[PDB]
Amino acid sequence: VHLTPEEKSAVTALWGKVNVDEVGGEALGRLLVVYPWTQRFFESFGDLSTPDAVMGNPKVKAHGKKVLGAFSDGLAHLDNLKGTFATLSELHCDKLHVDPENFRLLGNVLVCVLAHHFGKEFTPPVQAAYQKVVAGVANALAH
């Protein structure tokens, strides 16, 4: 992903204050709530009927922690996203059969979560930089 030095500095600075446990679980739960067809993949997690049940699922929170850890790993290697997300791409394509559009949906949900968490600190330039990082992670995973 090509980013300006200011864009990369802003992305790193915003990711500095991201709480790893809270941000990932909330993004995954909001994905499962807003796009209900995504629960097909996570049926093994457990009760996902109501939004309050989705947001209060320890398995969902733990998987969100894992997903956001992968996002952080991709952030630390922004110049080699395709090589960073190769094993995960194979896992999601060959074994899970997740459609590539769902990666873009999850990235957009994560951007909304970041905006909800940071408020006015999530300026439009920061949103643009994070949109590009999210698209790069999604294109790397869809490979």
Partner: protein
Amino acid sequence: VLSPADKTNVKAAWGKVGAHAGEYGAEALERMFLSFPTTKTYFPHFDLSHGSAQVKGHGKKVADALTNAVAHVDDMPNALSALSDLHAHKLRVDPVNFKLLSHCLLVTLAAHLPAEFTPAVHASLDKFLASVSTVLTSKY
């Protein structure tokens, strides 16, 4: 198709938005222009810089249309017919741009209403914006 629960959620969220609708719409337009370059091409006669009065007025118009849609959720196709003709027949806007504008509106609402943006309200607003987009992308 919306339900009474998410219809009430949408009405409450937009009422909490209130008089800041024009500011929110201008901010959403600026976010869309910054995040996506292709959307700007539809505004070659505009001044698309930060703090632009033209973008401010267009955001005011977009927010007024969204407020009308909120007030007229049950007859959206008949309430947004002129906008449908404008966007589809005359402007010929790609539906992907409608999706991007809906996303940027959601981001602005999340950034400005932390307490109001619960997951249920997020889903309700996503469905409402999707309904508006499909109404505007229909060719009669």
